[PDB]
Paper text:
In [name] ([name]), onset of programmed cell death is marked with the activation of [name]-3, a process that requires assembly of the [name] apoptosome. [name]-3 is synthesized as an inactive zymogen; its activation requires association with the [name] apoptosome. Activated [name]-3 forms a holoenzyme with the [name] apoptosome to cleave a wide range of substrates, leading to irreversible cell death. Here, we report cryo-EM structures of the [name] apoptosome and three distinct [name]/[name]-3 complexes that mimic different activation stages for [name]-3.
Multiple oligomeric states of the [name] apoptosome were observed after global 3D classification. Hexamers, heptamers, and octamers account for 80.5%, 10.3%, and 9.2%, respectively, of total particles. For the hexamer, the top ring-like density was of ∼ 5.9 Å resolution, and the “broken” funnel was determined to 4.2 Å. The gap of the funnel is not sufficient to accommodate a fourth dimer. The CARDs from [name]-4a (slate) or [name]-4b (limon) form the lower and upper CARD ring structure, respectively. In the reconstructed hexamer, the upper CARDs sit on the periphery of lower CARDs. There is only one interface between each upper and lower CARDs. Group II stacking is likely to be maintained by salt bridges between helix H6 and helix H4 of [name]-4a and [name]-4b (orange rectangle), in contrast to the multiple interfaces in group I, explaining its moderate local resolutions. In this scenario, we hypothesize that [name] hexamers might represent a pre-mature state of the [name] apoptosome and contribute to the regulation of [name]-3 activation. Most of the [name] apoptosome molecules are pre-mature hexamers, which may represent a potential regulatory step.
Numbering used by the authors:
A (entry chain H): 1 to 100
B (entry chain A): 1 to 416, 424 to 487, 521 to 543
C (entry chain D): 112 to 416, 424 to 487, 521 to 543
Write the structure that this text describes.
Amino acid sequence: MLCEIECRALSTAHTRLIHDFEPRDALTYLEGKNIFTEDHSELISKMSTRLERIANFLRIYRRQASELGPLIDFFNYNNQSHLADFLEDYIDFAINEPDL
Amino acid sequence: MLCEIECRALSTAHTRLIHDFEPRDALTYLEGKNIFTEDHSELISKMSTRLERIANFLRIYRRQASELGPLIDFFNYNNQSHLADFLEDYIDFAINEPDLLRPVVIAPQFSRQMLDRKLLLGNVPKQMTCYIREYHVDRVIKKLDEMCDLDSFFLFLHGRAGSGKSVIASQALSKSDQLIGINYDSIVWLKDSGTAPKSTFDLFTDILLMLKSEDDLLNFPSVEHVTSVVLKRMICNALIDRPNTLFVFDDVVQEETIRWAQELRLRCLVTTRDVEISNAASQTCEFIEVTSLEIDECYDFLEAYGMPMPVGEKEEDVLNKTIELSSGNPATLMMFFKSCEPKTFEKMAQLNNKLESRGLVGVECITPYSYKSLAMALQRCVEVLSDEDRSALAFAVVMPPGVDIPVKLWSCVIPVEQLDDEVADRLKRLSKRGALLSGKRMPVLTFKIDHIIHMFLKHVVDAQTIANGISILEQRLLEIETVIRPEDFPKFMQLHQKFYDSL
Amino acid sequence: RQMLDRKLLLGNVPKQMTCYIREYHVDRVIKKLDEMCDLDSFFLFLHGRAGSGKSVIASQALSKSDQLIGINYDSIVWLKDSGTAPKSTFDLFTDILLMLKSEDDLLNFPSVEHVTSVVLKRMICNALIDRPNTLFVFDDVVQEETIRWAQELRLRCLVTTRDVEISNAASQTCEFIEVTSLEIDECYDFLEAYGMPMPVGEKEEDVLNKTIELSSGNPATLMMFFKSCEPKTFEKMAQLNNKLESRGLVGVECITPYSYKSLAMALQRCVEVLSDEDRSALAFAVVMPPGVDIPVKLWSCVIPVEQLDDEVADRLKRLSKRGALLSGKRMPVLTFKIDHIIHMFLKHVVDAQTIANGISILEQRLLEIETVIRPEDFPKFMQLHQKFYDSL
Ligand SMILES: Nc1ncnc2c1ncn2[C@@H]1O[C@H](COP(=O)(O)OP(=O)(O)OP(=O)(O)O)[C@@H](O)[C@H]1O
Ligand SMILES: Nc1ncnc2c1ncn2[C@@H]1O[C@H](COP(=O)(O)OP(=O)(O)OP(=O)(O)O)[C@@H](O)[C@H]1O
Ligand SMILES: [Mg+2]
Ligand SMILES: [Mg+2]
């Protein structure tokens, strides 16, 4: 599981993950880095609208990964680096400082 | 407290919160996250049945929390995550992606049986399964769908008396599965018919009780004695647990109800005869008029109720006589059928006579109408009339029904310088208020009185005042088809000698 | 923006009107309320003529910004007064206490109907303890005692009223905002807002300057006007402009969001309340030409009562202070003025005799021995207004 910091990030950067993103794009990269299951990708891969595939990707994801690595290491490769940069910036303004 | 969205969710996801859940499980988690008290948990914790602990948890909760957060967390931790997931899905299809809530998270929730349950409890009557006025029931439902978004609004289903308005609301809330469940959560249908000044308060006494839980109808107090400011405050309070609740106000006569409906920020369907009650509301008022049944619709309506359709030419005419007399009126048409037992074209024509020599009383019968005959209804429409307007109407008997006729030709019989537009002003109020007359702007300002609206006055005004108005006309006679009567030829109302000699 | 509506509804605040929102006023109301959320108790007087629109503005001033409710004040209590009886000032505060009462224990509501004033007052605040920053709109005060109670109860009050002097009851500082007659430009805006056709020709605008002159910027009667123009054509708009001269306000009386069929039903009261002697002064003003700035002495002629008639002026001030029936002006010279809405009513209401008697009573003193006021060399002839005098 993640936590409040790592899940607060997927939520804060949500206005953005709706305008440009797609869970189908990440399913192959995650069935791979060992964070999904062939029913998981089925469940998120057959969804009529994208806000469905997105809400299931963000629900399913928060349970499966030991951390928020294999999703920064993806928006990079997917030409959606303006995303993986925002999230890595957010994880840093908490990892390198003890005050909020 | 929450709001209509957050409370509509606790209500939509209610079929579920009953099958698996328990308020005892959440009390500890909520005394904690700072929402309830040690009496709160006492009140919900000692309850014999769970539907009690549930209805108190959902009542008490909607008041206490600044938002719908902690509940999701609770459902998640409690291994009831199939719940906190449904509610978080619902809260998301509102803020970010609008519209999608009804097609996706609301439509599957539709349930006709629930509609019954919901219809019955909202005191909605049965609809006319036999004949359905296509056009109207449809357009009603449409304009209601357009507004479930709106926070408060008036829909005026206004028409003649017995013109069939109330039946259409029965059908418009009974056809689709959308209006109840999808667009609005609950229904409250209350018949007004208030004339006294205490009536507009008494109405809203029975709304509050239409709202109040099955529990505490026992505790119902002598609310009979308590100010208007309090019944009003008392309602809009018990109205928090009424998300997306619709209000049918079958038969409003007093514009004071409309004023209360707008102080109470209600969502209202309104059947009425007098349309001007809407001037009471400074607001989104939208209107649908129940017209006289078109000539083709009359046929459909007859066939639908086993009525024999014409063949010979003076048989379609026997039936055009009924349609002309009834002038496309649902209620008196129905009284006709119940009273044409023989069904013969013959006994159908017998009645066509009885109607000319006995007015509506010739066909008065036991009918689904609260009224033996349309005259019992119209009685009221006429009492309410401005004292001066009561006069104007009363003299309209002289005019031949079903004829488009000039304002000046009317200025002759109607009571009151040189410009008689005042006649027109009365005649407008007259069509606006029970749709007794009929306004028609060009080619030239002319009105017209139909037959049902006539044989009402025929057997109702002073037998003298008929003959006095006729003479008062023949005096102005001299003075100085698809074609309206010209000003070169008013001197002779004699065209209608036929329809005048029968006095 | 969904919490407000909860708070507005429960504080019995009416619905919000948006079709026409008097910018200036709703703004200035909100402002002067923001300045005071700090204060412990205070009176805000939104005074104006009958149907001048005061009550509507309080509906809007508490409905536009969400600061007033939540940020500046925690809750709202909006109660309509309209009290005339001596039991009314107590009955008001009875409901006030009831309003304080929560939903719980509205069941237990006692026969509080019978209990002293000292106790409803002590009891009210007992409940008030659970109320922080609770504004109290008192829509339509016509009794000073209500204010007196408001100040014994150390309340925070918005107040709509017609008679401004009720504020002399409060020793505490009371700020004021006057709802004036709708300016000529605002009238246009108001008309357009409600589908009313704007002139394309001089005659057209003059037809419309006739309505604005008759209505004299009175929203309530203006509204009654609109509701009564089905054709709406500049033509039927001018038809009515006539009906107004030959039938007074009763020519356009209609079903309106106003509790009143016509402005005459309202003003009725404003006139009953009047000092018995002042009721007299007002009653004779009908003879005077409306929308004309005219000297005190020229008034001393029709008004009842040594050699200094300032007493006339004293009555005429009370007269503008108390329903804003008259107009006040200090220099160039002390002159008052009666508008048309305030006039047509009198024209079609006051004893048909007393009109003609005042006209003659003026002629007796008439002989005596434009952007210009009438000079003392030329009072002998009120004949300038023969036009607006022959129509009697
Ligand atoms: N669609 C319909 N099918 C069958 N009967 C109808 C229909 N519409 C109207 N009627 C007749 O009218 C009677 C009830 O009329 P309805 O209540 O619909 O009119 P209404 O406009 O409500 O009159 P009111 O305003 O007086 O209530 C029924 O008993 C029936 O006789
Ligand atoms: N901003 C506005 N928009 C639309 N109508 C208005 C407005 N202001 C006033 N009115 C008209 O006046 C009526 C109510 O007037 P309002 O209650 O605002 O005046 P008022 O000063 O409260 O009079 P009173 O002191 O007698 O209560 C409304 O029905 C409407 O016809
Ligand atoms: Mg009915
Ligand atoms: Mg008011």
